[PDB]
Amino acid sequence: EARAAMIKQLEDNKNQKIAEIIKEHTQKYNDIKNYYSEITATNLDYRKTLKNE
């Protein structure tokens, strides 16, 4: 039972680590993608000036 308690403790610690790593990587990917997406939307709105010119 002590072995089991140790196993579950370390499992919980490292499962927290796994889930949190997945999380912050997901949010970092989202931030970068949104930055470039808004940049592209601005460029698409911008090219109309070239077309009118």
Partner: protein, 48 residues
Amino acid sequence: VKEHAKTEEEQTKNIEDLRIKGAKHYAELKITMETEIQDLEKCFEDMK
């Protein structure tokens, strides 16, 4: 007396071997199942 002593030895060996088989099966199943879990999620955001 010899027969009884040897017999209990067979029972002890059977118990130990079954325990070892159970531990190995447990580890094998755990790893095999966990094989196909992590390689998902963000991959779908890449395709989006």
